[PDB]
């Protein structure tokens, strides 16, 4: 049994990261997640913790599930040193490495065999591999775009199957990510998240932030609310917990990416004028394939992913395109 960390944590920098420190909340969250509904053999489970920070979540999770292996990747020296002292002698494996560098995994998993998960058939969420990560710091919006890309190509940690992942991140980032068609928050990442995953909002630190999300989704989600006080590094923006589960898809990622990339950079432009961005003569080509027309008056910001799939299908069938 590992020691729960309290306001000892009231002593570091964090580089823009924020952490929930109130154990009461984590319990509500873990009760809400009901992880063992999928991980029925926790003794067998292996967990990867990216940017643990204060290891409060790590100590609580471990204390509740005793996984086969819980590994924490902390790059920040002060925090690394902190965790190193607190959990000294614990079952937790604490390594100081950049969690957001491809080289780290190539070496810890492949080369050194320090942490190697069980690969499984992507017909169901991997049930022996779980990954948790804090992305509350700077550039979370970019890190997430990259993260998504790996689901699409099955790179990185996704080469092990459909692995569940719980991520903390600024609520503003969570609002773009979970944004639905038509919303102002709609961006390329919402479309990608829609296309490759089933993500649920599990917790948020500001009841005021819920208005940015879909009222209907907030319904189905019913996310645990908590305050700014339960977040250590104070005076920071509100954070949000998301459960990200990859899903199966059957379309051409390469072309789809090309099309969505172009259309979404002009997401506010009507579909009856934006097509020439795909290539010279694009509008005239597309106006001859698209019959519906009710969607010709829309904008990319209004389209669903299925509509995008349809649009890239037309793209590939574009004749005389060397
Ligand atoms: Xe678990
Ligand atoms: Xe790793
Ligand atoms: Xe969590």
Swiss-Prot record:
Misc. comment: Present with 9380 molecules/cell in log phase SD medium.
Recorded GO MF terms: DNA binding; methyltransferase activity; mitochondrial transcription factor activity; RNA binding
Coiled-coil segments: none
GO biological process, alphabetically ordered: methylation; mitochondrial transcription; positive regulation of DNA-templated transcription, elongation; transcription initiation at mitochondrial promoter
InterPro entries documented for this protein: KsgA/Erm (IPR001737), Mtf1 (IPR016586), rRNA_Ade_diMease-like_C (IPR023165), SAM-dependent_MTases_sf (IPR029063)
Homology family: Belongs to the class I-like SAM-binding methyltransferase superfamily. rRNA adenine N(6)-methyltransferase family.
Pfam families: RrnaAD
Catalytic EC class: transferase
Role played: Mitochondrial transcription factor that confers selective promoter recognition on the core subunit of the yeast mitochondrial RNA polymerase. Interacts with DNA in a non-specific manner.
UniProt entry keywords in alphabetical sequence: DNA-binding, Methyltransferase, Mitochondrion, RNA-binding, S-adenosyl-L-methionine, Transcription, Transcription regulation, Transferase
Record-given protein name: Mitochondrial transcription factor 1
The keyword Nucleus belongs to this UniProt entry's keyword annotation: no
Binding site for S-adenosyl-L-methionine: 20, 74, 98, 134
Domain of life, source organism: Eukaryota
GO cellular component assignments: mitochondrial DNA-directed RNA polymerase complex; mitochondrial intermembrane space; mitochondrial matrix; mitochondrion
EC number(s) stated in the UniProt entry for this protein: 2.1.1.-
Subcellular location: Mitochondrion intermembrane space
PANTHER family reported for this sequence: DIMETHYLADENOSINE TRANSFERASE, DIMETHYLADENOSINE TRANSFERASE 1, MITOCHONDRIAL
């Amino acid at each position: 049994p590992i020691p729960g960390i309290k306001d000892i944590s009231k002593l570091k920098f964090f580089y823009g990261f924020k952490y929930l420190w109130n154990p009461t909340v984590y319990n509500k969250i873990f009760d809400k997640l009901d992880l063992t509904k999928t991980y029925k053999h926790p003794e067998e489970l292996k967990v990867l913790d990216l940017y643990p920070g204060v290891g409060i979540q790590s100590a609580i999770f471990y204390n509740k599930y005793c996984p086969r292996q819980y590994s924490l990747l902390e790059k920040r020296s002060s925090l690394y040193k902190f965790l190193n002292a607190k959990f000294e002698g614990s079952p937790l494996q604490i390594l100081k490495r950049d969690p957001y560098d491809w080289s780290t995994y190539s070496n810890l998993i492949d080369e050194e065999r320090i942490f190697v998960p069980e690969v499984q058939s992507s017909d169901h969420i991997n049930d022996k591999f779980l990954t948790v990560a804090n992305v509350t710091g700077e550039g979370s919006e970019g890190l997430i775009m990259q993260w998504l890309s790996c689901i699409g190509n099955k790179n990185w940690l996704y080469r092990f199957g459909k692995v569940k992942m719980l991520l903390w991140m600024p609520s503003t980032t969570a609002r773009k990510l979970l944004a639905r068609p038509g919303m102002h928050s709609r961006s390329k990442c919402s479309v990608v998240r829609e296309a490759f995953t089933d993500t649920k909002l599990i917790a948020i630190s500001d009841a005021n932030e819920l208005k940015g999300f879909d009222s209907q989704c907030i319904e189905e989600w019913d996310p645990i609310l908590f305050s700014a006080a339960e977040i250590w590094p104070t005076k920071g923006k509100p954070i949000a917990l998301v459960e990200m589960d990859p899903i199966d898809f059957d379309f051409d990622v390469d072309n789809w990416d090309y099309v969505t990339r172009h259309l979404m950079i002009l997401k506010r432009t009507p579909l009856n004028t934006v097509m020439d961005s795909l290539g010279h003569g694009g509008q005239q080509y597309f106006n001859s394939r698209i019959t519906d027309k009710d969607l010709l008056k829309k904008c990319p910001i209004d389209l669903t992913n299925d509509e995008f799939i349809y649009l890239t299908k037309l793209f590939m069938e574009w004749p005389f395109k060397p």
